[PDB]
Design a protein around this ligand. Structure first.
Ligand code: CA
Length: 209
């Protein structure tokens, strides 16, 4: 009777990084921050794992919504697709600082995890390098779409993800699409937390009943 929002963190991001984000929401929305298990993994296989653990947390009748920042955007989209095919009620999908899924698969994911030689044109760089491998191996067919509205959010000074690469998220939905630009870089949300959350909450409760 109260919608539940699933929070998908960025590559290297934990559920603890999204405590401040979740705190900004009122009691009208339930928040479940996903914690990732962590040259063997892809976005769809990780989404299959997340979906298996996540499905029992909400009843088939329960209204659910998804939020993803950066890599979390690709995973949240993939888990939302699985929820829809399973017959769940997906209200909306909120994608932040994440490019729209590409249609081709790049064979640059067969490089060794010691990409230090190729990167030099250390342990702290491993999570970012593993994400590049998962992103270059991630593709989605043009026909694969959600039947719920998509809300895109981007930072004006983000070079990793721009309005141009976030715009094709409109083709990943059968319904409404909206894109909002906030001042900031790849982690713009830290400085725009009240306005971003009030926007997500308003839209989640709007589609809820
Ligand atoms: Ca805050």
């Amino acid at each position: 009777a109260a919608p539940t929002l699933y929070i998908f963190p960025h590559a290297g991001g934990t559920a603890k990084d999204y405590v401040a984000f979740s705190r900004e929401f009122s009691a009208d929305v339930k928040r479940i921050a996903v914690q990732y298990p962590g040259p063997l993994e892809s976005i769809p296989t990780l989404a299959d794992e997340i979906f298996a653990m996540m499905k029992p947390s909400a009843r088939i009748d329960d209204p659910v919504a998804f939020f993803g920042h950066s890599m979390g955007g690709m995973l949240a989209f993939e888990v939302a697709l699985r929820y829809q095919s399973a017959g769940h009620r997906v209200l909306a999908f909120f994608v932040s600082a994440c490019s729209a899924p590409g249609h081709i698969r790049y064979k640059q994911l067969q490089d060794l995890s010691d990409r230090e030689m190729l990167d030099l044109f250390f342990v702290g760089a491993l999570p970012t390098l593993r994400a590049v491998r998962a992103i270059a191996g991630y593709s989605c067919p043009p026909e694969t779409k959600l039947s719920c509205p998509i809300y895109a959010f981007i930072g004006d000074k983000d070079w990793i993800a721009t309005q141009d690469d976030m715009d094709p998220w409109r083709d990943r939905t059968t319904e409404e699409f909206s894109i909002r630009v906030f001042p900031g870089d790849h982690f713009y949300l830290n400085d725009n937390l009240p306005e971003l959350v009030s926007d997500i909450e308003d839209k989640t409760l709007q589609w809820h009943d």
